[PDB]
Design a protein around this motif. Sequence first.
Motif, PDB file in Angstrom:
ATOM      1  N   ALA A   1      -2.928   8.947  -6.381  1.00 63.77           N
ATOM      2  CA  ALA A   1      -2.069   9.096  -5.222  1.00 63.77           C
ATOM      3  C   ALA A   1      -2.038   7.790  -4.440  1.00 63.77           C
ATOM      4  O   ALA A   1      -0.994   7.380  -3.950  1.00 63.77           O
ATOM      5  CB  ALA A   1      -2.573  10.216  -4.342  1.00 63.77           C
ATOM      6  N   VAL A   2      -3.182   7.137  -4.317  1.00 70.23           N
ATOM      7  CA  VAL A   2      -3.224   5.880  -3.598  1.00 70.23           C
ATOM      8  C   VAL A   2      -2.431   4.825  -4.387  1.00 70.23           C
ATOM      9  O   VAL A   2      -1.622   4.089  -3.802  1.00 70.23           O
ATOM     10  CB  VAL A   2      -4.679   5.445  -3.366  1.00 70.23           C
ATOM     11  N   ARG A   3      -2.618   4.791  -5.712  1.00 61.82           N
ATOM     12  CA  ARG A   3      -1.890   3.834  -6.557  1.00 61.82           C
ATOM     13  C   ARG A   3      -0.390   4.058  -6.460  1.00 61.82           C
ATOM     14  O   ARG A   3       0.386   3.114  -6.454  1.00 61.82           O
ATOM     15  CB  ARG A   3      -2.321   3.950  -8.029  1.00 61.82           C
ATOM     16  N   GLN A   4       0.023   5.315  -6.395  1.00 65.95           N
ATOM     17  CA  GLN A   4       1.441   5.614  -6.283  1.00 65.95           C
ATOM     18  C   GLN A   4       1.969   4.980  -5.002  1.00 65.95           C
ATOM     19  O   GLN A   4       3.061   4.429  -4.969  1.00 65.95           O
ATOM     20  CB  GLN A   4       1.660   7.129  -6.264  1.00 65.95           C
ATOM     21  N   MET A   5       1.167   5.060  -3.952  1.00 64.64           N
ATOM     22  CA  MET A   5       1.529   4.512  -2.656  1.00 64.64           C
ATOM     23  C   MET A   5       1.731   2.995  -2.787  1.00 64.64           C
ATOM     24  O   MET A   5       2.762   2.455  -2.400  1.00 64.64           O
ATOM     25  CB  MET A   5       0.415   4.854  -1.671  1.00 64.64           C
ATOM     26  N   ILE A   6       0.748   2.323  -3.365  1.00 57.06           N
ATOM     27  CA  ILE A   6       0.817   0.889  -3.571  1.00 57.06           C
ATOM     28  C   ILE A   6       1.944   0.425  -4.503  1.00 57.06           C
ATOM     29  O   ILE A   6       2.351  -0.730  -4.443  1.00 57.06           O
ATOM     30  CB  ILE A   6      -0.490   0.370  -4.163  1.00 57.06           C
ATOM     31  N   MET A   7       2.443   1.307  -5.363  1.00 56.94           N
ATOM     32  CA  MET A   7       3.491   0.935  -6.313  1.00 56.94           C
ATOM     33  C   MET A   7       4.870   1.483  -5.966  1.00 56.94           C
ATOM     34  O   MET A   7       5.817   1.332  -6.742  1.00 56.94           O
ATOM     35  CB  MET A   7       3.117   1.414  -7.717  1.00 56.94           C
ATOM     36  N   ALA A   8       4.981   2.119  -4.806  1.00 55.75           N
ATOM     37  CA  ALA A   8       6.244   2.698  -4.373  1.00 55.75           C
ATOM     38  C   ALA A   8       7.390   1.689  -4.377  1.00 55.75           C
ATOM     39  O   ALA A   8       7.240   0.559  -3.913  1.00 55.75           O
ATOM     40  CB  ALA A   8       6.087   3.303  -2.988  1.00 55.75           C
ATOM     41  N   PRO A   9       8.546   2.087  -4.932  1.00 56.87           N
ATOM     42  CA  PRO A   9       9.753   1.262  -5.021  1.00 56.87           C
ATOM     43  C   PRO A   9      10.670   1.451  -3.793  1.00 56.87           C
ATOM     44  O   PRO A   9      11.228   0.483  -3.275  1.00 56.87           O
ATOM     45  CB  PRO A   9      10.388   1.744  -6.319  1.00 56.87           C
ATOM     46  N   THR A  10      10.828   2.692  -3.333  1.00 58.48           N
ATOM     47  CA  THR A  10      11.655   2.962  -2.158  1.00 58.48           C
ATOM     48  C   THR A  10      10.796   3.544  -1.035  1.00 58.48           C
ATOM     49  O   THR A  10       9.880   4.338  -1.276  1.00 58.48           O
ATOM     50  CB  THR A  10      12.825   3.955  -2.462  1.00 58.48           C
ATOM     51  N   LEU A  11      11.086   3.143   0.195  1.00 61.63           N
ATOM     52  CA  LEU A  11      10.318   3.643   1.320  1.00 61.63           C
ATOM     53  C   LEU A  11      10.453   5.148   1.391  1.00 61.63           C
ATOM     54  O   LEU A  11       9.584   5.829   1.926  1.00 61.63           O
ATOM     55  CB  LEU A  11      10.791   2.991   2.613  1.00 61.63           C
ATOM     56  N   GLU A  12      11.543   5.666   0.835  1.00 58.25           N
ATOM     57  CA  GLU A  12      11.768   7.107   0.811  1.00 58.25           C
ATOM     58  C   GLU A  12      10.661   7.748  -0.034  1.00 58.25           C
ATOM     59  O   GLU A  12      10.318   8.920   0.145  1.00 58.25           O
ATOM     60  CB  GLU A  12      13.151   7.425   0.217  1.00 58.25           C
ATOM     61  N   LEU A  13      10.104   6.966  -0.957  1.00 64.35           N
ATOM     62  CA  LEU A  13       9.030   7.455  -1.814  1.00 64.35           C
ATOM     63  C   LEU A  13       7.675   6.975  -1.306  1.00 64.35           C
ATOM     64  O   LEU A  13       6.679   7.700  -1.398  1.00 64.35           O
ATOM     65  CB  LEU A  13       9.238   7.002  -3.267  1.00 64.35           C
ATOM     66  N   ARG A  14       7.634   5.761  -0.760  1.00 62.34           N
ATOM     67  CA  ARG A  14       6.374   5.242  -0.248  1.00 62.34           C
ATOM     68  C   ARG A  14       5.880   6.097   0.903  1.00 62.34           C
ATOM     69  O   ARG A  14       4.693   6.096   1.224  1.00 62.34           O
ATOM     70  CB  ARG A  14       6.495   3.793   0.228  1.00 62.34           C
TER      71      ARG A  14
END
Lengths: 862, 862
Positions: free
Chosen positions: B564-577
């Motif tokens: 979950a943390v990695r997903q945060m760090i790799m987010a492409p759109t702020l809508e996803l970050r």
Amino acid sequence: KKRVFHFGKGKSEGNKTMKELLGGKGANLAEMASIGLSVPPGFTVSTEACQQYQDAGCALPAGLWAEIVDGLQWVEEYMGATLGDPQRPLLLSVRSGAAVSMPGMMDTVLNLGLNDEVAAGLAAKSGERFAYDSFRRFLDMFGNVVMDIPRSLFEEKLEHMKESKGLKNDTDLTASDLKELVGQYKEVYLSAKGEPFPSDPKKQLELAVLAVFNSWESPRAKKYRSINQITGLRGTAVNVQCMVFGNMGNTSGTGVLFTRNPNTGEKKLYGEFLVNARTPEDLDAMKNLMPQAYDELVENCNILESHYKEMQDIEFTVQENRLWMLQCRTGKRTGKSAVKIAVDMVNEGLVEPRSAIKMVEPGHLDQLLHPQFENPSAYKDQVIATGLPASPGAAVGQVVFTAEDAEAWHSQGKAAILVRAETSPEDVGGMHAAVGILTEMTSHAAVVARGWGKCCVSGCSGIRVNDAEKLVTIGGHVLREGEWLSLNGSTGEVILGKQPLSPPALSGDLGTFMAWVDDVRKLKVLANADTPDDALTARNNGAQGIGLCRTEHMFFASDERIKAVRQMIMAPTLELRQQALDRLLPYQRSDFEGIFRAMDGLPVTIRLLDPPLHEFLPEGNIEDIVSELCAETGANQEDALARIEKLSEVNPMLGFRGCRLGISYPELTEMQARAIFEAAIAMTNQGVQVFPEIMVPLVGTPQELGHQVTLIRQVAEKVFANVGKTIGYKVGTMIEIPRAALVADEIAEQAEFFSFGTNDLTQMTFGYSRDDVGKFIPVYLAQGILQHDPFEVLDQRGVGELVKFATERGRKARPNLKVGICGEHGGEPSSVAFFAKAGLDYVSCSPFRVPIARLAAAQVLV
Amino acid sequence: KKRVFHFGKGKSEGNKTMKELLGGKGANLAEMASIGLSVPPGFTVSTEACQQYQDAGCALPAGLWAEIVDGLQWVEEYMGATLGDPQRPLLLSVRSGAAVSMPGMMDTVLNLGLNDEVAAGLAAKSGERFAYDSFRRFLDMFGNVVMDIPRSLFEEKLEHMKESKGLKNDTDLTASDLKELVGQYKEVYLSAKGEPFPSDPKKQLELAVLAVFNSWESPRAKKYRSINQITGLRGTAVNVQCMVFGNMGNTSGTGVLFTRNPNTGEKKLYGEFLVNARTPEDLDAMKNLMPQAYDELVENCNILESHYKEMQDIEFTVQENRLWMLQCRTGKRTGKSAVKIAVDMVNEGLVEPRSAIKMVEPGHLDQLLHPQFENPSAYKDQVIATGLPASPGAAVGQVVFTAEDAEAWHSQGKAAILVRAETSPEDVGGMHAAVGILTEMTSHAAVVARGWGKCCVSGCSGIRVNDAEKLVTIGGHVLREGEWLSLNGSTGEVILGKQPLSPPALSGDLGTFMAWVDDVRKLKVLANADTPDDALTARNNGAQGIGLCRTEHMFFASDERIKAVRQMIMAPTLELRQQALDRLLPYQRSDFEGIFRAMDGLPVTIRLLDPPLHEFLPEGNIEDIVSELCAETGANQEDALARIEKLSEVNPMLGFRGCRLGISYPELTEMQARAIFEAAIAMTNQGVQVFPEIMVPLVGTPQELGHQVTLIRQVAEKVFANVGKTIGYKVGTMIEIPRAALVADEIAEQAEFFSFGTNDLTQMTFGYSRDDVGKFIPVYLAQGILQHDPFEVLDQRGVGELVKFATERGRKARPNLKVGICGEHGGEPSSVAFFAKAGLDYVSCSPFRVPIARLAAAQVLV
Ligand SMILES: [Mg+2]
Ligand SMILES: [Mg+2]
């Protein structure tokens, strides 16, 4: 006059000291007048009048208007004109101004006291198109700033007129068109305000004054005051003055000039005059048309320089053969002009040295330390691109694309411009050989050039470097290996061809100016140099010795020296590890002899090995690093890999380095001390005066220092005995660990001198890895979390307190403790100023920063 | 008596206060006598006598010998024996002793006043073999220490005798053999000294005294004094006393004992007695043979405890039915015994609480915080190896070889012993599930166990772990998955089978003792916990809240949370970050609710994200790191690689972490603050008392703190409004940057509390990367450059000064500023003591260190 002060040529109730009552601008106007400058007459409403205003129920105070009227009458009688009279017209300007700078105040209003009748009286000598264009602008300005009418209402009719007329670029609007707009504008007054535009000059003035008083409490003005915690103030003043024009015939005009040439410093009026208002004509043309005017100008300029003790940039207007002084300010100038002017003014007996020193800025002086082109303009028709001024200076050489080629050119005594899309730490050797560097102000190449004093245009992204082929795509032209190219590291330009370089200066004014600088400063200025050639360049720049010679940098000098260090790190038997150290001893001894000779008669401070051993290892894929080490040292794969991992570190800036290495491997420090003392004796025997100083890096306790000092003194005794001769020397330490500052009293027992390493001190104090700080500093600066980057500008409040504590406690223990600083702040003006007042004995910086340091060390004292 | 003081049962001219004149040992002997202890009579020559000696031409002072003779006469008349008389023999002992400890002084000399005549008179009741063996030893000792005769001369004849006799292990030498050696030894006196062995007791004594005086200026003694800068002293004293033996028949013997059981604390004499001197016999056997003696022993022990207020370890000798007290010292004991004794002595009215607190050492108390075996001896016949006490405590479980298996055992409520040749940061999950850890005191596994309070035997190199197969080679036995194994993290032993664990303690003495501890201490003791379960374990150990909850550690909890943390760090759109942050919010909110409930009624301080983002990335070959990230987050290879490099740092300890991250990515801090406040309200609504505290990591300026504080307060306002409820809370900061300490007055304007992070503070102050310091610390300690490792023991002089400055300046700005420390020094006795006197409000440490902290916070005050 207790609230309204008038002023005119040689007349003024106020004086240059009344910045409180007359505001900054008022006091200056009074001063300008008080010394006989031809300034249009006017008067100033004190800040008290503004206070009484806001206090007496925020309304016009009693008696004020009376005084204001006296003032205007005084001005009218003075100018030979009256407010609201077509025949003898009088137009005014209303500006605000507090004792200090203050935004959000009422904008300047020109040509007040204008109306339909006066506008016509104006069209008389100035013209119709000008008169009504001015009337239109005034209605707009006065309406928006004084009556609070949206500019949009006015612009709505200005562009709606073109939509019918046929233009959008106002300047085509005819006289009648302007008269039509004047009518349409006044209607805006009735539509927005309900009432008509005050046609009575007196009513306008009154309103304008009230408009200014009310500007003190404006939104912007209050936020500003609220942010800086500005209190006590009391309000803003009201500066009123007469308008003047240079379009009332051929007996009028406007001009600007510098009392002295801003490019060369030649004591000659330098400017241009415009008749009746086209393109400008030089000064000489003014006298040949308005003699009494040009003569008045001359006496005005002489007065300015006599009183303000500085060259001036001004704006004047001659109206009907009568000169008027409107704007005066200290004139910007090149460094060449700055130095010549400062020196001539002293020779003229106008200013004394102590004052001349403040007339040349670090930026000015920098310009004179590097070669420059003869005419950056003469080559405008040849420029082919523009980048970033990575490192100031002019350079002319043949294009090359590899460090090796640059070095090759240098070895044949030829000039080359190293060109690489980007650079790396391996090209450093070629970058030093090139007379100029160009890559496709923060780039790592730029920084490097600066120290060397080498020209460099970085960030020139509009360039494509073809490696396969030996050519480069820049602008529209293509350049191939061997072709000439000129670089301006100051402007960032990339001229084409071989442009001329200004020949050496023969005036001697720089030498003269710098002697004053050196007489005034108390701080000595040393240089940071690690090679015999840099030591020489530092001495030629006025360095009084070497404050820091980094021994680690003496090995990254040649592939051979680097391999020698690796052999040392990979030694299997001490019988060989000593043989490797013995190999490093010659390189060191040879370099020290060279440095000592170049510094004959001056102190030379050499620092013991500081970088972690990992640094001397090849870079790249691990497998390849291992292969290279085996081939270079004879080690097997297993041992090489084990050694590489063993030397690896998580945080190398705080790892196994500095004295930690010297203490763990005594032989290393014994080798360097032997190298130093033997080089010293050898050069003394040849008649060179040698004053060696040995410094221990990264000390955090008195014990670490004592351990190394003992080692050094032992080697000194043996070398002196073996060579049958003894010479004086000193042992000291770096203070770059916050703990060292805290126990500086104890450390001072063993150290004869302190040398602050503010680079590292700043890193540990802020807990900032300079290598990685780039990821948040921009945000910190943008967000106001940091005022300046601590690595460039010394953080006086934090790092500064540690420097003070350390200095005080160290000297309390050893009264004659010599204390210096060798971090990069040593060449930064505001930092140098802090070190001077902190009572340091000296600063040490790169060779080409030395003159700047010297200048700064003097300026802080006067 | 001005230079010689005699002493005996209930008699002594000196007293316990004369440590200067009588030396430490003399003063004690006098005190022991002054209270009626059965100590053999003797006298002490003052240190003045030693000074007058060295001053009066380093020769025996006038009148001294006279007094010495008085003393001996007094002793002889007292004992009913005479010096140099076979019938009524008197043998003496001569010991030195200054006011303080001092090496290089004359060694103890026993049985002085012995000769051929006396030796025979001794063989009378003690035996022949003993008499001459003693005479031989005396000749040797007296000759070497008093006459300066090389021991070698004596040993030359002792081994030359066996070379003819037939043995080498002295003990076989018969009576006549000893008599022959006695003769050969005396000849050594004539050969080496020229003159004969002084057979006159008086001459021996005189020499012995002079021998002692001369020992004050011995080489070793002077170097020692010279090193510690010990001055003023004045010299050493001469303690003379009567010898006694327990081999003069069945009416004599020797014994040792503890006035109380050193293992359990039971108030009962615990020792053993040896008749006529074999193997010892218990105490009860003494009275059944020497009634008047055993009774005297009893009264002696009661006196010792009554006067010294402490259990005693002694050595006594009963000679011909008369008891003698020879050696007394505070007795070593287990923690169990320490606590029981301290509590019984208070109940007995012998000591008051304030004194009892000093009777239990941190080491003693530690023993009672972890489970222990019922009889480490009962399992001696089962031990199969020994390693290092990585983490104290007894453990019994089934052998397993993977973290996953340990976790599996734990999930079924079963006990497992995790066994791995070595451990890694990935096995941390299983190491916590295991009841015990064993690897093939500094190992990284050991450290981890300690905090958890988990048993761990590291460095047991004599072990081979077969992974392929599920077995392990230890000692001579082979253990396979599922087999029982016992571990002692205190001793380091690896017993075989299922040994019994002592059942919970019911005495209540620990509870009683700890209540005194808690009454006396002023410092509050908080806990460092990041999970609901650790919060509970901390509360059960007496923690008064949580001083540090590390939010980064709340994510390395499960693969899911980490991804979950990695997903945060790799987010492409702020809508996803944001969707990723929203995902992290639940995990956080859920954990905080749990922690709050466990800490119901106590303050809980939660720290904002501190580690650099790089930490949450997979490890291994770059190519593999990229593959995992793409699969886990959906990113493509290019972006993943760019991101990995971008997050890479040269010195991560000083990089993009802490508030730098919180400031650059506001949403991150807004998410955590929301999580905190929402968890707080939810638990309050359920009746839990919540006192939340939010702390900002790694602050170096007031601005960084202010920025984060503003963010926190904004989120608090919204959450309170959205939930229609408000609760109190506090905002504070960590003080781990040296700069923060320097500007603590400014920082205190925004922070309601200070929490020192001495781990980081120590790193930046010393410029020590703890991750890499291991490469030179051993050398620094060995070389005396460092007294202690700064990371374990707070450097009071350096880091300590910053803690003081910060505390003083912070409180001057905000008088009620709460100030604590959460670095590891928070659980270290000497560090806790410094924090108490520095005026801190509390200390916070790991859960199982809490009782130790409490003990230390009390001991420093009494
Ligand atoms: Mg440094
Ligand atoms: Mg920290």
